[PDB]
């Protein structure tokens, strides 16, 4: 959940708050 527009970052994944205000991130595997 978020503000439509902002781009955050998971451990090693990119997230882009979709027009519907939700965190849609990539599903890659992060070692850290």
């Amino acid at each position: 959940k978020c503000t439509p527009g902002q781009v955050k970052q998971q451990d090693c994944n990119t997230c882009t708050c979709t027009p519907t205000g939700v965190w849609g991130c990539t599903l890659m595997g992060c070692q850290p």
């Binding site: 439509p4 781009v7 998971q10 994944n13 990119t14 997230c15 882009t16 979709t18 027009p19 519907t20 939700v22 965190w23 849609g24 991130c25 990539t26 599903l27 890659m28 595997g29 992060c30 070692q31």
Partner: protein, 241 residues
């Protein structure tokens, strides 16, 4: 292609252990130290298709014929990447055209546990509601921070891009297809993995695990790169290289 020697039995958050070698085209992309960071699919003896956001380098390795990543008794095939072909229209902003081809420096050896998945026609159409399967060594709980040892599988329906937009709005482009929101969900570690549907008797790669809910919500559709909308590119790359 798309005909496993070991027929898969079907009854990733909420997945289930696959029959060993029942998804022969499923490879694992690992870094120098053996860490699994993405899935991939063998489309022929020299190429593997995966998601563009996995950022694979020739310094990474493709592992085929693997079921239990913790086992050392399996007869796997660690192959080297000769060259990476990232789709030029990929955008890390919209996560669209999320696809990358990997030309191997040494062809794989097809056998009972290693073979290729079929590619669809740019015109091929897969109806919404169609049950398909996705596989992978992705988290089995967003609350696990540890991937499963054994390959998982899950059945899930395809959604029409129209219904899918009710969930993600305009982030859903034409080169994207959604599946899920049915009790299962791909998760960290599943990226690049396949989404295959059985058509006319053979398994066809219709989607590539791309992105979805940040908490692998089993009630939110997952987004996959739509292969039918990217095959021409895939074909041309193979033909020219």
């Amino acid at each position: 292609c798309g005909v496993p020697a070991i027929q898969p039995v079907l009854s990733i958050v909420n997945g289930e252990e696959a029959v060993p070698g029942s998804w022969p085209w499923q490879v694992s992309l690992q870094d120098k130290t053996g860490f699994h960071f993405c899935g991939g699919s063998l489309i022929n003896e020299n190429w593997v298709v995966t998601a563009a956001h996995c950022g694979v380098t020739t310094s990474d390795v493709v592992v085929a014929g693997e079921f239990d990543q913790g086992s050392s008794s399996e007869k796997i095939q660690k192959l080297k990447i000769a060259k990476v072909f990232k789709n030029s229209k990929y955008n890390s902003l919209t996560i669209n055209n999320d696809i990358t081809l990997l030309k191997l420096s040494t062809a794989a050896s097809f056998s009972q546990t290693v073979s290729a998945v079929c590619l669809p026609s740019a015109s091929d159409d897969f109806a919404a509601g169609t049950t398909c399967v996705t596989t992978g060594w992705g988290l089995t709980r967003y609350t696990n921070a540890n991937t499963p040892d054994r390959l998982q599988q899950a059945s899930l329906p395809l959604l029409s891009n129209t219904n899918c937009k009710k969930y993600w709005g305009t982030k859903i482009k034409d080169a994207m297809i959604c599946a899920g929101a049915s009790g299962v969900s791909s998760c960290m570690g599943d990226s690049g993995g396949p989404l295959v549907c059985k058509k006319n008797g053979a398994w066809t790669l219709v989607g590539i695990v791309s992105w979805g809910s940040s908490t692998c919500s089993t009630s939110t559709p997952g987004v996959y790169a739509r292969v039918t909308a990217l095959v021409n590119w895939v074909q041309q790359t193979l033909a020219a290289n």
